[PDB]
Write a protein that binds this ligand. Structure first.
Ligand code: CLA
Ligand code: CLA
Ligand code: CLA
Ligand code: CLA
Ligand code: CLA
Ligand code: CLA
Ligand code: CLA
Ligand code: CLA
Ligand code: CLA
Ligand SMILES: CCCCCCCCCCCCCCCC(=O)OC[C@H](COP(=O)(O)OC[C@@H](O)CO)OC(=O)CCCCCCCCCCCCCCC
Lengths: 74, 742, 73, 74, 90, 161, 163
């Protein structure tokens, strides 16, 4: 059971990294702004700074507070 | 002509430049356009060569900075003596040194940290110190806290004096360049007047203060009724009843009947059985002899009275057929470049500190030092790390000299030019020897791992298997064990109990020193040490020799000493600068010193340190498993890293819990360093751009534009955090383990 | 190792080793066809990542299986 | 303990996603490298100019996110 | 390369042999009542049994001392002879 | 009880931990003279532990299996003092700090050399900005409603798409 | 103006080498010039035979005194077979090296100029057929040397100190 769980979880993580890498490759090599004009993909590209900044905030908040609670308990 | 030359009031004492941060450089004096400026302000503050091209001003800055460092060290020492005077159990430890743990630091009761005030003994609670200051003060003859107080007050006075001296020699009377370039006078004064006279003075202290007080202490006299040192100096009959030769009173010294001083100027060797340290009579004779030697040696160079040596003429006269002009032009190098002197002195100081580390455990010079295993381990590890850092710094400053201070016109067909001209052969052969050593040591460890895992213990490299005996080291030990018999007939004992003879010194119920045996494991670990040292030397020497140019970038001198790269061309020029070579040599020195200290710790806990019973049975801290477990990497993982780390991780809820906390925190800092080491700069710059957008949306973006750390700064931060985490992890682990098992 | 030291050190070292091979007797008779070069930057990152991941996976798999099967509990 | 470790898991997921989405959305360009699309997916750097451009490609974002996914699955 | 890099003056080895036999073959009044060369000759005398090393016997120390002395004497003799033709000290 | 947690007043594990800590401190105490300063320190420790455990019991903390207070952060009225009340205090302090920092940045963007004002802080200006953080939420709401809090997207640098 | 033993490579300061006693001593240079690898006029087959003989003969020993069966009664046979297998693998190495490096019908690219400048004939070892002959001779000589070492050590049992 332990081996199966660890196996499929690591496989899933690698697969997710691959999915995001191929999304990046799509944007570089296959994304045409002419045909994708003001659709959902173009709107993601438009407010990407907001997305990245809010991900940064969520990561910072989680890391700070979880690490602080752990160090407090230690 | 050697004369005193100064300039009056060169720099006005004013706070005007305190308000201007980057005043020392033209680039930083404009202002902080970006955040990088702040970091640059701290990275160019002490690079005096970069501030100006004037060597006189650089020399003045260096002199005053040295005065400031001396003041800082005086403050630090005064603090140690103060904490010994008030927040210490020094007198209780004097009454019973074998059962009271030294402690000189007491925490405040604020957040439960008061648990750190452990029961060290003598009716005292505090942090158990491992600096060896208690034993040093015992050797010096200090018996009361009043003496520590007066020493601390004198230390504060000397710190103020050094601070004033720095101010005076920068702002009021600044020496000229001719004064600094008098290297012959400087050597004569630092040999005769600094080392020789200092050794003579310390011999005087020992003769008049340390020997009588310490021999009364060895006799069992309570320190309270031990007469004060000035009573020994004044009432010389009181001193003569301990050593009768004092009744002669300087007559033997001037009649050359020096043998009459054999009472307190001995050449015994070995250890004092009562304290486990060196005999202080031997130490006094040692210091007197080296004082005489240094005072003689300091009369070698010609300053202005004729009679002496011109070092320029000595150097120019040493050349041969295999070299060109030999040591021609090196006098100008070493009298006009501060970085060359810094490189030489750093290398020598690091090697000297390593010698100190090796020699202070084999001959413990202080009473009750060997049996204090925590102090021994701490001193060894501390001085090993200091020496390694200094050696790497010597490499760094040799590279800096090669980049900036090197002048090809005045260096033609000399030794430096010829070394530059066959650097390819040097680095080729050093690379080959590094590969050969790595294979025939670590591959031997891997062979042992594999045969142990395959169930073939007879195919391993051990004492019960194919044996690799260190016959040369064993022969050297045998020779040193028999030195008093034939080779040094005026010696009672050998140089150290580690050579041989079957003698075991056991202060209290512990073991001070005993003959250290060498076998296959010692062969393997010494060859591992050689491998690590040669690889570090390879990295550093390749950085120094190829700092100016290489087949890849023929104009690397124009790029500078501290630059990230030259671009992604030629396949990629990442880390081509000598600074990056120092950056990697820091990692390799870290590995070398780490393995050295691990070997020391395991060997001592396994074969030397232990407890002896009344019958005479000697049991060791680990149990003598180094000979059979150090041959295998799994043995290192299990019997050393896993077995001996049981105490740092179980230290919670006790006075050693701080060691576990810092163990984990150092692990954290190391892991944190990993991302500065692995990541780049564009990624973080773009993340910073997104964060800056977030701030601009709310009109809170700073005018000082946030920038990611430079590439070189990224590497510097990574290596700094890496070394801090690793070294602090080991520090916590050793201290917890050795306080628990000792 | 592949993630910390980046490229230039190894390119200079390989230059030195090429000189050494070309100047050594009985071995300069043997010649390479592809000029030896240090690994590229992207290749170095990928090789270091592969080593890191393989070590991660093997270390944790060994620990997991050994600690769950040594004590069936 | 389950609370703290699930929040650590959320931290790991959020940070790995931050790295991967940042690589995917900055793949076509950024303020440091506005013409990143012409250089492809996996290129070393853009040289030491403009302060330094190490790990400026989206492939380098994937490289940096593999460490975080390994940590999170660990 | 001129094929005479080690300018052959075969008198150097004989002069060094004489100048190292003279100091080593001296009855020193110190702990060594006899001379060290006689010890370095006794060593081989006790070690003439075929197929066996000295095994940490009192032979290695004398060997090392005597041969280091011989090597330094030979090197200094070579340097002294070949520095006169040159102007290293003149 | 809020996830099967007993109150710490009648929690046997909580009392067991009390007893164990007091017993450990007394065992450490037995090796010192009563009049000695270490004895006074250990007795102060014992009093501190006793008052700490009494305070934890008196506020109705929830102890789980064994004695360990557990915090409820779901908004329950009986546990507002664990996260909601200190949480609000934190929000007031953090918003204070951020708001006054933002105000200082605003007030130094109109200066002739703002960077010098950032590396060398105008202490009088900074202090009279800091004094304004007492009523920071009101100012934040006013700026949000008036439109002076958020910059328009047309005046913010963005990278090419 | 001193003697200056060390000189540039053939007097050329701009070639990447030096003239050292290690490089071109009369004894060292004589020794290296007469090694079978450097006897360019001799046929590659005989040079390969000599090289393989020497190498198999020296290779037999380590396998015999360090192999896994060094404590068994088949120690000699095991070591000899290990040496022969290493010789065979190195023969494959030489064959593939010759296949990759040299093409049939091409002239030799080995240096045909001496230090003096005699402009001798190019060495035929650096050719497809030359390397093929060298590899065949090396195989034969390696097997012969392994057999000879095994015969001297075990079949004949000559007295040797360590074996
Ligand atoms: C359905 C699955 C799938 C498919 C069809 C593809 C297909 C492709 N990918 Mg994608 N990818 C996937 C999954 C997939 N990938 C996953 C799961 C990941 C995350 C790890 C990625 C991450 C990824 C990146 C980051 C890139 C690609 C690229 C590519 C393209 C070229 C690949 C190449 O050169 O192969 C050649 C194969 C290799 C180089 C792999 C060599 C072996 C690797 C290093 C692992 C070896 C480990 C170890 C040494 C072996 C075990 C040792 C043992 C002792 C333990 C191709 C279109 C590239 C691309 O499009 O370029 C623009 C590119 O840059 N992929
Ligand atoms: C233990 C190791 C470690 C730690 C703590 C971090 C921490 C962080 N990384 Mg890094 N990282 C690491 C290893 C680590 N990383 C490694 C090995 C890799 C692979 C190369 C990366 C790759 C990586 C990438 C690619 C990214 C991060 C990001 C982040 C942030 C995630 C948010 C977070 O946790 O905020 C909480 C913050 C922390 C946990 C940092 C420590 C805070 C300390 C404890 C507080 C200060 C203490 C004290 C006052 C300082 C004293 C010093 C001195 C003044 C005396 C955070 C700064 C992401 C980021 O920056 O997004 C915002 C991001 O994009 N990291
Ligand atoms: C240089 C080495 C050194 C080191 C590392 C220490 C370290 C320490 N000393 Mg020692 N000490 C030293 C030198 C040193 N001292 C010297 C040279 C003297 C002689 C003057 C002393 C005299 C001394 C005394 C008399 C005491 C200590 C104490 C302490 C401890 C607490 C420090 C403290 O009270 O700060 C507290 C913090 C401050 C003073 C900083 C206040 C200013 C900050 C910035 C806030 C200001 C805010 C606002 C502007 C007002 C600490 C372990 C104390 C101790 O161990 O008690 C058990 C103690 O009582 N030291
Ligand atoms: C006997 C004469 C003498 C003595 C004792 C020293 C001693 C010292 N010199 Mg040297 N020096 C001398 C002559 C002497 N110097 C001469 C003649 C010159 C000119 C050619 C120099 C030029 C020189 C330079 C350029 C530098 C030194 C430095 C140092 C200090 C190195 C730190 C150290 O290990 O000290 C260990 C010992 C102590 C820390 C004890 C405290 C110092 C006491 C008070 C002795 C000071 C002796 C002083 C020279 C006497 C004149 C001062 C007097 C007017 C009050 C050391 C104190 C370096 C340094 O750190 O500068 C501060 C340095 O950079 N010296
Ligand atoms: C710099 C080091 C130093 C200093 C300042 C002194 C100072 C002193 N010594 Mg000491 N002494 C020293 C080193 C030193 N000694 C050393 C190294 C030796 C060993 C050779 C001695 C051996 C020695 C003897 C045997 C005697 C002194 C005596 C004295 C005192 C009178 C002689 C004098 O010049 O004044 C004086 C307190 C005499 C004394 O104590 O008279 C009261 C005395 O009898 N000294
Ligand atoms: C006698 C000792 C000595 C002296 C006088 C100097 C003097 C100098 N060095 Mg050298 N150096 C030394 C030892 C020494 N170094 C050693 C031992 C090393 C090996 C690590 C080096 C490695 C080295 C490099 C690689 C470089 C220098 C540079 C410099 C110049 C300083 C410019 C600068 O940025 O510093 C300002 C001061 C700092 C940057 C120090 C900041 C703090 C450090 C980085 C971390 C502190 C660690 C701390 C202990 C951690 C715990 C506390 C923490 C929790 C708060 C100056 C000429 C630089 C130079 O000349 O550039 C051209 C340069 O590039 N040195
Ligand atoms: C455990 C990790 C590790 C290992 C094994 C190595 C290995 C090596 N490093 Mg690296 N290095 C590392 C971590 C490591 N490094 C890290 C973290 C850093 C960052 C500071 C560096 C930085 C660094 C630099 C800057 C330099 C090296 C150098 C070296 C070499 C040492 C000498 C040599 O080649 O012979 C010894 C080789 C080994 C010990 C490798 C293992 C070989 C084993 C014993 C035998 C296995 C073979 C076996 C038959 C299996 C065959 C496989 C086959 C079936 C495919 C070697 C390639 C130096 C170099 O170039 O060499 C001179 C050099 O200059 N490294
Ligand atoms: C026993 C050993 C010995 C020693 C110490 C010397 C020492 C000396 N010889 Mg002599 N020499 C020796 C053996 C020795 N030689 C022999 C065996 C011969 C062959 C016959 C010669 C033939 C010879 C000639 C022909 C000349 C010398 C000269 C010299 C001087 C030149 C400097 C020198 O060689 O470095 C000695 C180094 C030091 C003294 C300092 C360092 C000491 C150690 C190595 C550290 C020096 C005094 C020359 C000279 O000065 O002429 C007057 C000279 O012309 N020597
Ligand atoms: C996974 C494949 C594999 C296999 C099947 C083997 C098999 C073997 N190895 Mg291992 N080995 C391997 C991989 C492998 N190895 C790898 C990857 C390494 C590097 C880490 C090693 C490193 C290694 C060492 C260091 C040693 C072995 C030895 C041995 C032999 C065990 C002792 C024995 O047979 O008695 C004694 C041996 C014999 C009686 C006969 C050996 C000689 C025969 C004739 C070899 C066949 C030669 C043949 C002409 C060519 C065939 C291959 C060719 C087509 C490439 C055995 C044949 C031991 C040995 O004896 O080496 C020779 C030994 O010391 N191996
Ligand atoms: C085998 C090499 C033994 C070299 C033994 C040796 O020490 O040679 C010493 C050799 C002799 O040169 P001289 O000492 O005569 O040159 C005069 C010196 O005083 C000038 O520094 O020095 C060199 O040629 C450079 C270093 C040799 C290369 C070292 C490689 C190892």
């Amino acid at each position: 059971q332990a081996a199966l769980y660890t196996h499929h979880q690591y496989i899933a993580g690698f697969i997710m990294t691959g999915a995001f890498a191929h999304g990046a490759i799509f944007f570089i090599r296959d994304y045409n702004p002419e045909q994708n004009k003001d659709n959902v993909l173009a709107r993601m590209l438009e407010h990407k700074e907001a997305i990245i900044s809010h991900l940064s905030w969520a990561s910072l908040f989680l890391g700070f507070h979880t690490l602080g609670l752990y160090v407090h308990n230690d | 002509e050697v004369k005193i030359m100064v300039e009056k009031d060169p720099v006005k004492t004013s706070f005007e430049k305190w308000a201007k941060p980057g005043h020392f450089s033209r680039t930083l004096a404009k202002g902080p356009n970006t955040t990088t400026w702040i970091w640059n302000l701290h990275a160019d503050a002490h690079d005096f060569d970069s501030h100006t091209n004037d060597l006189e001003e650089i020399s003045r800055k260096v002199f005053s900075a040295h005065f400031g460092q001396l003041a800082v060290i005086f403050i630090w020492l005064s603090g140690m003596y103060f904490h010994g005077a008030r927040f210490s159990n020094y007198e209780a430890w004097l009454s019973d040194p074998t059962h009271i743990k030294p402690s000189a630091q007491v925490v405040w009761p604020i957040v439960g940290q008061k648990i750190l005030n452990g029961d060290v003994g003598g009716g005292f609670q505090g942090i158990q110190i491992t600096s060896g200051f208690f034993q040093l003060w015992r050797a010096s003859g200090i018996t009361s806290e009043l003496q520590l107080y007066t020493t601390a007050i004198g230390g504060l006075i000397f710190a103020a004096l050094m601070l004033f001296a720095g101010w005076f020699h920068y702002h009021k009377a600044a020496p000229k360049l001719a004064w600094f370039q008098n290297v012959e006078s400087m050597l004569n004064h630092h040999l005769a007047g600094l080392l020789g006279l200092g050794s003579l003075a310390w011999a005087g202290h020992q003769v008049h203060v340390s020997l009588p007080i310490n021999r009364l202490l060895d006799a069992g006299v309570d320190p309270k009724e031990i007469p004060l040192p000035h009573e020994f100096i004044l009432n010389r009959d009181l001193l003569a009843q301990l050593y009768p030769s004092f009744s002669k009173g300087l007559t033997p010294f001037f009649t050359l009947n020096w043998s009459e001083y054999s009472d307190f100027l001995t050449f015994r060797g070995g250890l004092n059985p009562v304290t486990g340290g060196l005999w202080l009579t031997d130490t006094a004779h040692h210091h007197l002899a080296i004082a005489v030697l240094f005072l003689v040696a300091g009369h070698m160079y010609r300053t202005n009275f004729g009679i002496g040596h011109s070092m320029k003429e000595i150097l120019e006269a040493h050349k041969g057929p295999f070299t060109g002009e030999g040591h021609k032009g090196l006098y100008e190098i070493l009298t006009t470049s501060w970085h060359a002197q810094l490189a030489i002195n750093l290398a020598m100081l690091g090697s000297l500190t390593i010698i100190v580390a090796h020699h202070m455990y084999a001959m413990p010079p202080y009473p009750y030092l060997a049996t204090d295993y925590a102090t021994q381990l701490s001193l060894f590890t501390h001085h090993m790390w200091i020496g390694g850092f200094l050696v790497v710094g010597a490499a760094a400053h040799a590279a800096i000299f090669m980049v900036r201070d090197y002048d090809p016109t005045t260096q033609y067909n000399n030794l430096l030019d010829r070394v530059l001209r066959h650097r390819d052969a040097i680095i080729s052969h050093l690379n080959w020897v590094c590969i050969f050593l790595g294979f025939h040591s670590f591959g031997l460890y891997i062979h042992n791992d594999t045969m142990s895992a395959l169930g073939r213990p007879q195919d391993m490299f051990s004492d019960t298997a194919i044996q690799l005996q260190p016959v040369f080291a064993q022969w050297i030990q045998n020779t040193h064990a028999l030195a008093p018999s034939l080779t040094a007939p005026n010696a009672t004992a050998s140089t150290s109990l580690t050579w041989g003879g079957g003698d075991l010194v056991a202060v209290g119920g512990k073991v001070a020193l005993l003959p250290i045996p060498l076998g296959t494991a010692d062969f393997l670990v010494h060859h591992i040490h050689a491998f690590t040292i040669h690889v570090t030397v390879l990295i550093l020497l390749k950085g120094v020799l190829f700092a100016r140019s290489s087949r890849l970038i023929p104009d690397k001198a124009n790029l500078g000493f501290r630059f990230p790269c030259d671009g992604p061309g030629r396949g990629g020029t990442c880390q081509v600068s000598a600074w990056d070579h120092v950056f990697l040599g820091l990692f390799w020195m870290y590995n070398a010193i780490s393995v050295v200290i691990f070997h020391f710790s395991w060997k001592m806990q396994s074969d030397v340190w232990g407890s002896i019973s009344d019958q005479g049975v000697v049991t060791h801290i680990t149990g003598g498993n180094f000979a059979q477990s150090s041959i295998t990497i799994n043995g290192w993982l299990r019997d050393f890293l896993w077995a001996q780390a049981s105490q740092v991780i179980q230290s919670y809820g006790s006075s050693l819990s701080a060691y576990g906390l810092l163990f984990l925190g150092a692990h954290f800092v190391w892991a944190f360093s990993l991302m500065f080491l692995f990541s780049g700069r564009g990624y973080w710059q773009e993340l910073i751009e997104s964060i800056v957008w977030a701030h601009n949306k709310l009109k809170v973006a700073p005018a000082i534009q946030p920038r990611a750390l430079s590439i070189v700064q990224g590497r510097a931060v990574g290596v700094a955090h890496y070394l801090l985490g690793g070294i602090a992890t080991t520090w916590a682990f050793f201290l917890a383990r050795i306080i628990s098992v000792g | 190792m592949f993630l910390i030291s980046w490229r230039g050190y190894w390119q200079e070292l390989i230059e030195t080793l090429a000189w050494a091979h070309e100047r050594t007797p009985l071995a300069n008779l043997v010649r390479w066809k592809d000029k030896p070069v240090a690994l590229s930057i992207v290749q170095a990152r990928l090789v270091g990542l592969a080593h890191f991941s393989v070590g991660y996976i093997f270390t944790y798999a060994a620990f997991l299986i050994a600690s769950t099967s040594g004590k069936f509990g | 303990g389950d609370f703290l470790v699930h929040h650590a898991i959320a931290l790991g997921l959020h940070t790995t996603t931050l790295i991967l989405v940042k690589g995917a959305l900055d793949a076509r360009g950024s303020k440091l490298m506005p013409d990143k699309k012409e250089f492809g997916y996996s290129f070393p750097c853009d040289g030491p100019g403009r302060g330094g451009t190490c790990d400026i490609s989206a492939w380098d974002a994937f490289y940096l996110a593999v460490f975080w996914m390994l940590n999170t699955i660990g | 390369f001129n094929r005479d890099w080690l300018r052959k003056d075969l008198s150097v080895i004989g002069f060094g042999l004489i100048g190292w036999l003279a100091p080593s073959s001296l009855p020193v009044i110190n702990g060594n009542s006899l001379t060290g060369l006689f010890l370095g000759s006794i060593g081989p005398e006790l070690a003439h049994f075929p197929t066996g090393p000295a095994l940490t016997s009192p032979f290695w120390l004398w060997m090392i001392t005597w041969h280091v002395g011989l090597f330094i004497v030979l090197t200094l003799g070579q340097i002294g002879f070949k520095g006169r033709q040159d102007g290293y000290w003149n | 009880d809020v996830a099967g947690l007993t109150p710490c007043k009648e929690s046997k594990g909580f009392a067991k931990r009390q007893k164990q800590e007091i017993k450990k401190l007394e065992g450490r105490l037995k090796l010192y003279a009563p009049d000695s300063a270490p004895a006074l320190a250990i007795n102060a420790t014992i009093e501190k532990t006793k008052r700490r455990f009494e305070f934890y019991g008196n506020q109705g903390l929830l102890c789980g299996t064994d004695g360990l207070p557990h915090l409820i952060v779901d908004g329950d009225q009986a546990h507002l003092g664990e996260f909601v009340y200190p949480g609000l205090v934190f929000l007031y302090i953090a918003g204070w700090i951020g708001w006054v920092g933002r105000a200082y940045l605003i007030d130094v963007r109109t200066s002739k050399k703002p960077t010098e004002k950032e590396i060398i802080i105008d202490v009088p200006l900074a202090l009279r900005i800091m004094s304004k953080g007492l009523t920071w939420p009101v100012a934040a709401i006013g700026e949000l409603r008036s439109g002076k809090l958020v910059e328009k997207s047309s005046n913010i640098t963005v990278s090419p798409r | 103006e001193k003697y200056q033993v060390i000189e540039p490579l053939n007097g050329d300061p701009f070639i990447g080498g030096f003239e050292t006693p290690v490089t071109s001593s009369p004894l060292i240079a004589w020794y290296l010039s007469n090694l079978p690898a450097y006897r360019t006029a001799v046929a590659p087959l005989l040079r390969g035979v000599e090289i393989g003989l020497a190498h198999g003969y020296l290779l037999v020993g380590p396998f015999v005194l360090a192999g896994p069966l060094r404590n068994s009664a088949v120690r000699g046979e095991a070591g000899s077979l290990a040496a022969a297998g290493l010789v065979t693998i190195l023969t494959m190495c030489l064959t593939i090296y010759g296949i990759a490096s040299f093409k049939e019908g091409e002239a030799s690219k080995a240096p045909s100029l001496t230090l003096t400048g005699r402009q001798k004939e190019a060495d035929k070892l650096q050719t497809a057929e030359g390397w093929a002959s060298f590899t065949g001779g090396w195989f034969f000589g390696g097997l012969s040397g392994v057999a000879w070492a095994y015969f001297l050590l075990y079949v004949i049992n000559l007295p040797y100190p360590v074996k």
